[PDB]
Amino acid sequence: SAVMATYLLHDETDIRKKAEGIALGLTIGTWTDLPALEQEQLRKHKGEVVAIEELGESERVNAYFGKRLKRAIVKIAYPTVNFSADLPALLVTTFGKLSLDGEVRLLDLEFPDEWKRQFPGPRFGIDGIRDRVGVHNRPLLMSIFKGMIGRDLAYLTPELKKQALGGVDLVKDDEILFDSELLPFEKRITEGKAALQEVYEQTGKRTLYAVNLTGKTFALKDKAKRAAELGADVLLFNVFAYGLDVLQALREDEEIAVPIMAHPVFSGAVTPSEFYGVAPSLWLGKLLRLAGADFVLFPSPYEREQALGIARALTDDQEPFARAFPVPSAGIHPGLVPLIIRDFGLDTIVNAGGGIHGHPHGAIGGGRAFRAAIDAVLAGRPLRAAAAENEALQKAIDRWGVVEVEA
Amino acid sequence: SAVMATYLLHDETDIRKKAEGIALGLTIGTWTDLPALEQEQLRKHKGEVVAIEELGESERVNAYFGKRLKRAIVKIAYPTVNFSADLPALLVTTFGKLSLDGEVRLLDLEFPDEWKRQFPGPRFGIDGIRDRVGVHNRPLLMSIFKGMIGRDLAYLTPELKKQALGGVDLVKDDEILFDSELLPFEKRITEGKAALQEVYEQTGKRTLYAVNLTGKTFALKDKAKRAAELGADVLLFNVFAYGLDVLQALREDEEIAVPIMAHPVFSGAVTPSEFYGVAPSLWLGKLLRLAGADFVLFPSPYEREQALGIARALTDDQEPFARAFPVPSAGIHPGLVPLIIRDFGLDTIVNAGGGIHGHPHGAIGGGRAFRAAIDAVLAGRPLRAAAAENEALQKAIDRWGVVEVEA
Question: What does the record give under GO molecular function (chains A, B)?
């Protein structure tokens, strides 16, 4: 029937008026002066203002724009008969011209179920990922392969093993690691798999490798299919540099079918502003899940309510899709595990680059500390307590501190 | 050698410090404590701060953020050896993590020639388009097919002919016109072509039809190839909802090879902010031309210097690519032709929807007024002068007014 879009509007003129204009202008154009007979025939395509909520003016905003700006949250319904069932049409219909209209920020989108049922959602999602790694009662632990730019395969392997030996469940490439002569995509996958197979054989633990899927759009699917045939575990994808629709295409391709980890890189071109853009809960949360991302990384709150909103959209039980793994990233260290579990729960992933490699004992000590921190929180005991009987965790807390959260 | 990126930074802490951190952090990561021998080997991948320009604090900004923010324009060089030669890599490398870093806005990008020579640029560009329409000494005139949502083929044809008969050089679909049962893509192309062939046979002038290319990314090329085989004139593409790289893929496909018109729809999610995002001259100008757009529509200045900057990037003679047609859009009416020619020159396109259909005499009178306005400016005479001897132009000025510009 209709997709309901929610916006934040900052404007001098009458709000209800602009809202009405939007609902009409972005759909059938004119209405008042059309013959009754013709209105009956176009009724089905007519947009309608669903609701308005004045929020009152803000002295801070007013002072900034040098004028008085009324603020409001306007919800508008756009009949689905007006556009095709794909993300590009959705974005253009709900925020195409509107994004050029001044101070209008897209806050959220609501889809009728039959429409929504036309999108894939995650392929594996949280449960699917937990089954493949065989870890069901604790958040997962992931490290970022730091300092690989300019390095070659021979450097990759020992570095990859070192992180696995620290007890991490996953190791992901750096977001800015692109295909090169030094380290080709297929060889990174193949040798990475062999290196982790060795660590598996040595300790009995299997660590998954999330490899960066880059290059030109129309080369992606063949590259992914190939990765799948070579045994890749997870495909890291910089979705925001290619368009949401590409993520959904990779998702729906039965010849790939490997978990997809979505990186937030470049999403900041769209979300930070207070008056423009699209809210992160929608841009990184709702849409990425709907498109097919199994894991979604986003900036850690260590804005807080913002990060919770994204996780909320990623894991909301109400959606007809599997849940996606929320992964707060940036600055994560063992001392934050208590807050991470408090804020995001068990179905989250502890992701760290500097927190692993930057540990005084190296990557292995880095992983040890994280694993110790996670067990402590789960055991309900203070990290400083467990730290006394665990060297690695102790060094972590001395280096980065800790924020305890009572069991 | 290296792509030079220019940013606008708003920050409390020392500017030169953050800049240095960026140049280093976004490339090799660490440097100071690496063995000399290892530095020699990684030198080639090391980013460098190329220049800084303090701009002094702004009381308005400070008052808004509630703190003192130093402002500066920082230029940074990222060795091309660090990434692959494609737009996604470029965006992620130069504004991937940085877009999440707070108040950092991407202003411009400069590419070494050998690197730049790896991108297509427009296929036809201004000269190519002017030869296909056979009009070399006046700006072109284009109308937008308004009110087609909910309408069918039988309504399309007479409506299309009416605009052509007004003397316009091109008619483009509405940006939010998607494929449907009422009017399929291939039939819109086929019947549109037959309608304009009829007008050609009656007037001796062939008007071009710019049809909206929509749908899912991996269905685009087949759809475009097909349009080309059916005789489509121009393909309208909402590039910003699919990723720059998709535009370049359509561009480089020898089985399509028809002119591509880029719409600015949704680009506003990225450009309006003063502290974040990407500057329009780069987002709609430099990159769209480099990617392959023959025409680029952007919001008309009727911000001014901003619009000039985009046109400037689109037509800059220094680039190794053909020039792209700058097309200021929104609110255009005959009374603005004098300013449009003054600001953008002859190699521009007068684009109007409401200025055509909203004319008291209808679409034909709408096209007539525009054609009269354009000739007047070229004859060096005041529109009010010509209006006296031209009914349609007279009605235009009475309805929307005019801003004269002395010859």
Answer: 2,3-diketo-5-methylthiopentyl-1-phosphate enolase activity; magnesium ion binding; ribulose-bisphosphate carboxylase activity
In 3D space, the residue among B342, B336, B344, B328 whose CA is nearest the CA of residue B383 turns out to be: B336
Q: Are both A129 and A190 inside the same structural domain?
A: yes
Q: Are the beta carbons of B299 and A100 separated by less than 8 Å?
A: yes
Alpha-carbon distance of B167 to B203, in angstroms, equals 9
Give the technique used to solve this structure.
X-ray
In chain A, the number of structural domains is 2
A26 and A161 in a single domain? The answer is: no
A149 contacts on B by Cβ (under 8 Å): 27-29, 45, 82
Which one of the listed residues A46, A67, A97, A187 is annotated catalytic?
Answer: A97
For residue B226, the tally of other CB atoms under 10 A from its CB is 15
Q: Is B166 helix (H, G, I), strand (E, B) or coil?
A: coil
The verdict on A238 touching B (C-beta cutoff 8 Å) is: yes
Last residue of a domain, one of B100, B119, B138: B119
CA-closest candidate to residue B375, choices B133, B138, B166, B136:
B138
Does B103 share its domain with B209? no
> Going by C-beta distance under 8 Å and a sequence separation of 6 or more, which residues neighbour residue B403?
B335, B336, B338, B339
Resolution attained, angstroms:
2.5
**Is the same domain home to A137 and A47?**
no
* CB nearest to B269's CB, from A29, A89, A277: A277
Chain B contact for A92, CB < 8 A? Answer: yes
CB contact under 8 A, B272 and A269: no
Residue A240: DSSP 8-state:
G
How far apart CA A367 and CA A116 sit, in angstroms, is 40
Tell me the C-alpha to C-alpha distance, in Å, between residue B98 and each of A394, B25, B278.
33, 10, 11
b/e per residue, B100-134, with b = 16+ CB within 10 A?
bbebbbbbbbebeeeebeebbbbbbbbeebbebbe
Task: Supply the DSSP symbol for B324.
Answer: P
* Binary contact (B88, A241; C-beta < 8 A): yes
Kindly list the catalytic residues of B. Answer: 97
DSSP string, A183-235: S-HHHHHHHHHHHHHHHHHHHS---EEEEE--S-HHHHHHHHHHHHHTT--EE
Distance CA A334, CA A376 (A): 11
Distance CA A87, CA B236 (A): 17
Q: How far is B151 from chain A (nearest CA, A)?
A: 8
Tokens 């096209």 identify what position?
B367
Alpha-carbon distances of A202 from B69, B223, B263, rounded to whole Å: 54, 53, 57
The partner residue sitting opposite B92, judged by closest CB among A95, A238, A275, is: A238
Nearest CA in chain B to A249: B218
Q: How far apart are CA A270 and CA A267, in angstroms?
A: 6
Residue B183's domain comprises 120-407
> Which residues of A make up each annotated binding site?
146, 172-175, 263, 331, 353-354
Residue A115 shares a structural domain with residue A146? no
Contact B215, B193 (CB under 8 A): no
- With an 8 Å Cβ cutoff, is B92 touching chain A? yes
R_g of chain B, CA atoms, integer Å: 24
CATH number at residue A77: 3.30.70.150
Placement of tokens 């269905």 in the chain: B219
Residue contact A216–B101, C-beta within 8 A = no
State how far residue A22 is from chain B, nearest Cα, in angstroms.
14
Residue of A215, A246, A269 with shortest CB distance to B278: A269
Instruction: Please state the residue numbers annotated as binding site of B.
Output: 146, 172-175, 263, 331, 353-354
Q: How far is A95 from chain B (nearest CA, A)?
A: 6
Residue A208 CB burial class (10 angstroms; 0-12, 13-18, ≥19): buried
Residues B281 and B349 in one domain: yes
Q: Is some CB atom of chain A closer than 8 A to the CB atom of B30?
A: yes
B63 contacts A238? CB cut-off 8 A: no
Place of tokens 């801003």: B403
